Structure 1
Amino acid sequence: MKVLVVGNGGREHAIAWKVAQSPLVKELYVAKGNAGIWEIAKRVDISPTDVEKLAEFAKNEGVDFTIVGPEAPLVEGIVDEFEKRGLKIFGPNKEAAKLEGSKAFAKTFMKKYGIPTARYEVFTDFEKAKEYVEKVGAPIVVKADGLAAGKGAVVCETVEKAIETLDRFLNKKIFGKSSERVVIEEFLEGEEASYIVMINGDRYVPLPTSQDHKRLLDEDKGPNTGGMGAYSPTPVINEEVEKRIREEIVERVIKGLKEEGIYYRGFLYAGLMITKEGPKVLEFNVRLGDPEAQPILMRVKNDFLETLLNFYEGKDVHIKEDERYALDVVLASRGYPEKPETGKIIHGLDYLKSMEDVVVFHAGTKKEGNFTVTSGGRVLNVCAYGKTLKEAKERAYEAIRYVCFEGMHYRKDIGDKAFKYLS
């Protein structure tokens, strides 16, 4: 068949990489892609968020199946549009999208339905927010309601930082139509980790477990980014903790969707905090995370295309998780996250293509002639397998020594939190 991935980023490289592996696909299109994806997939030069021109293109072209990468297409109703046009597409519809696409919706779900989450008041007047920060204190945490391109949640150490944040969101509306409603939750402590499932109505298959590293620098310092690296499986989520997420989060999220008559066909990624008091939802995402998809997807041993197709229509599916660990180290350009400098030649990619058990997932890459150059803030994911995490981490830094672009920055400590739980 003819499969299409929507998105341009390292997640979507992962999606098409794993998919190109299935003997079922005969042509692979990506809607826009990056220099990395173009080695495998026809580039379609239509924006991911250009949802009606996407659908018509996929309709004329005869695209037999399509998977969505990023949140914004999902949310703007891509799924709705595909269906108009008789199209098989994996991802939530626009109505189901609201679990990410409006935070205070999901926060009302979660409490209307018993899912462990962080104490919340939702505010649309700037003045009524104001004294609730000084009423319950510092901690606190302040979040835009809509897509702010990940750029929307603000952990505040002081009340002043919190009000300053609320000011930019609610008064200045930096974020537009999506900052004019806030969320103020308690700051939770513990290890964060991610749980990911595919949901199709009332069935759900889990996905490899995974931990992201959001901060820029080594020892969890610097600005907070979209993720600088991930690894799978994370030992943060036990047996006992897993057993808990499934019961207390996913299956409640499952009754809730029944009780609202909201039909969910897609990925659901809980971003969690494992507190001492149990696993809690910090947020819901309606797609794979980036860079978490990358190692999750390395660890999917069976034909993911076929599992998608099959899950897609009510059929019955499993995941063989690979027994090797998978670690993905993110290469950023100078200036990331606030203003990334771009245009830099990338050298030594061809050395990584003969290195055992290394996998490169392009982020921000485009072509300038016969050069591969940076296009963006996050550029490369140099990933690897290991019999242990130690090995996965070592093989990913070994690989990195061969590759390079001016300005390149990466964290050296990806996986490091897993080593206390391991032996």
Structure 2
Amino acid sequence: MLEKVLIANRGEIALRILRACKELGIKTVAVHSTADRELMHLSLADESVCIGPAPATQSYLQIPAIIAAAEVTGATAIHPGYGFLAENADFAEQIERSGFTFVGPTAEVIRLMGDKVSAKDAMKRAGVPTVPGSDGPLPEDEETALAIAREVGYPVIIKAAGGRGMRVVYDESELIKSAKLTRTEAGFGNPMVYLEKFLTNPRHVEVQVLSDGQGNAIHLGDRDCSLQRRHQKVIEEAPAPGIDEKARQEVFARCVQACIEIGYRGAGTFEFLYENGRFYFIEMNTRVQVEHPVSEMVTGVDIVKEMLRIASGEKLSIRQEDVVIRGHALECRINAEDPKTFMPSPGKVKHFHAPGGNGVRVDSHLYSGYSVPPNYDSLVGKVITYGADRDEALARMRNALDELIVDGIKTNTELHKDLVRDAAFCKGGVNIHYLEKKLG
């Protein structure tokens, strides 16, 4: 088992990793900025190093600082969490070159899946397509343009190389004339246009995987993260409800195959747009995600603990047949921001009370007397509920939100209270446009 892990992150995810480490008997090193001296996980850590001043560019993103801290402390592995350096290939690469273990995949794989073109090609080999369109620019030759559009299937969208100069074509009789016109409207200066399928009910559905880098990979089911504001996730659930079971099993199998083909090691997520029966690939997150807990609840697998086991050189443990999705889970991201204007709300928490009881889990670094600093993102806690079915998860989230007190700062709790009583959301299957249209 890994001797000593340096937690190259902050906030709730730092505490999450720390907990996984203690369960496995792994010694911990926390790193923090001067603005983060009050972080809950610091005094639970075996060692703590102040690596720089408040700004993330001068502390948490400083590769030399993190590596110096690892060397001073004798850390044998680094867990980057999510954000910061987690998908920075230069960092993984330095860790490799220095002889440390990275709790995550290789730099090479991070680069592969961090570039749109090479990521697309890797998924194509595994049998998974992207959102249908012209690949890439739509030609001026009429019959080639019409042939591409027909395969894509109407309606189609015609986009400029630059939500601007954008045009929907409903029927193929109007295609040439409309493409023609979208090119003329540039001079943006560039007269390149491409074609993209119009999706009517696009849902964000993503597949969780674990892969040991020794030829084994499994899925831990999927999640729906369609409630988004400015592409920031708000509520997540697992499994994604109302998904065509055949299409799901096919995409699970293809995701597992992809892992094996690209040589993936660690926890990762394949993000898709799901459109009435079909999965279209968007990107792979080559790291753990914020919303991992909902998959933990419905599978009974501890994702962070498995990452650590894999990083220490073990094969999975879990066969696919041992993975059964049971019940339903929900997560609400509690952000220190205005619930209506979404302005961050740094400040002192005079009183923090967490929800409790059956099927209620809380992942948060909040405590009474803690000051949320202005410098970093707004995520302060995650309330996660688990039930026998979606309705029970929702009911438990209603109870949980009623008990949550974060006094002294503004949070998005009221928005959550509205969402778990919202008719469309309670019926289920809302798409990625829902929250922004409803908010205005």
TM-score normalised to the size of structure 2? Answer: 0.67
How far apart in 2 are the matches of 1:339 and 1:39? 31
Q: Which amino acid aligns with 2:397?
A: A
Mean CA deviation greater in 84-93 or 399-408:
399-408
How far apart in 1 are the matches of 2:160 and 2:317? 36
8 A Cα contact 1:139 1:157, kept in partner? no
Superposed, 1:236-275 pairs within 5 Å as: 236-237=242-243, 239-252=245-258, 254-255=260-261, 257=262, 263-275=263-275
Residue 127 (structure 2) aligns with: 114
Q: Which amino acid aligns with 1:231?
A: E
Kindly state the Cα deviation for residue 61 of structure 1 after the two structures are TM-superposed: 1.0
Superposed, 1:60-71 pairs within 5 Å as: 60-71=72-83
Q: Which amino acid aligns with 1:94?
A: A
Secondary structure, aligned partner of 1:7: coil
Secondary structure, aligned partner of 1:35: coil
TM-score normalised to the size of structure 1? Answer: 0.70
Kindly state the Cα deviation for residue 91 of structure 1 after the two structures are TM-superposed: 1.4
8 A Cα contact 1:35 1:362, kept in partner? no
Secondary structure, aligned partner of 1:199: strand
Q: Quickly say closer, same or farther: Cα 1:187–1:93, change in 2 above 3 A.
A: farther
Superposed, 1:273-292 pairs within 5 Å as: 273-290=273-290, 292=291
Q: Which amino acid aligns with 2:131?
A: A
The reply to whether residue 399 of structure 1 matches residue 400 of structure 2 is yes
Residue 177 (structure 2) aligns with: none
Kindly state the Cα deviation for residue 276 of structure 1 after the two structures are TM-superposed: 3.4
8 A Cα contact 1:104 1:122, kept in partner? no
Kindly state the Cα deviation for residue 243 of structure 1 after the two structures are TM-superposed: 1.8
Kindly state the Cα deviation for residue 244 of structure 1 after the two structures are TM-superposed: 0.6
Q: Quickly say closer, same or farther: Cα 1:400–1:105, change in 2 above 3 A.
A: same
Residue 176 (structure 1) aligns with: none
Kindly state the Cα deviation for residue 186 of structure 1 after the two structures are TM-superposed: 3.4
8 A Cα contact 2:205 2:226, kept in partner? no
Superposed, 1:134-153 pairs within 5 Å as: 140=157
8 A Cα contact 2:126 2:257, kept in partner? no
Q: Quickly say closer, same or farther: Cα 1:119–1:253, change in 2 above 3 A.
A: farther
Q: Quickly say closer, same or farther: Cα 1:250–1:184, change in 2 above 3 A.
A: farther
Q: Quickly say closer, same or farther: Cα 1:27–1:108, change in 2 above 3 A.
A: closer
8 A Cα contact 1:155 1:187, kept in partner? no
Secondary structure, aligned partner of 1:269: strand
How far apart in 2 are the matches of 1:141 and 1:31? 47
The unaligned stretches of length 5 or more in structure 2 are 53-58, 138-144, 169-187, 430-440
- Structure label with greater radius of gyration: 2
Kindly state the Cα deviation for residue 227 of structure 1 after the two structures are TM-superposed: 0.8
Residue 361 (structure 1) aligns with: 363
Superposed, 1:293-332 pairs within 5 Å as: 293-299=292-298, 301=300, 307-312=306-311, 313=313, 315-318=315-318, 323=326, 325-332=328-335
Structure 1 vs Structure 2 CA RMSD:
4.5
Mean CA deviation greater in 300-309 or 81-90:
300-309
The reply to whether residue 209 of structure 1 matches residue 222 of structure 2 is yes
8 A Cα contact 1:139 1:158, kept in partner? no
Q: Which amino acid aligns with 1:35?
A: L
How far apart in 1 are the matches of 2:97 and 2:113? 23
Q: Which amino acid aligns with 2:105?
A: P
Secondary structure, aligned partner of 2:348: coil
Percentage identity across aligned positions? 18
The reply to whether residue 3 of structure 1 matches residue 16 of structure 2 is no
The reply to whether residue 81 of structure 1 matches residue 85 of structure 2 is no
Number of equivalences: 370
Secondary structure, aligned partner of 2:233: coil
Kindly state the Cα deviation for residue 204 of structure 1 after the two structures are TM-superposed: 0.9
How far apart in 1 are the matches of 2:330 and 2:239? 9
Residue 165 (structure 1) aligns with: none
8 A Cα contact 1:12 1:69, kept in partner? yes
8 A Cα contact 1:59 1:87, kept in partner? no
How far apart in 2 are the matches of 1:157 and 1:337? 31
How far apart in 2 are the matches of 1:362 and 1:420? 27
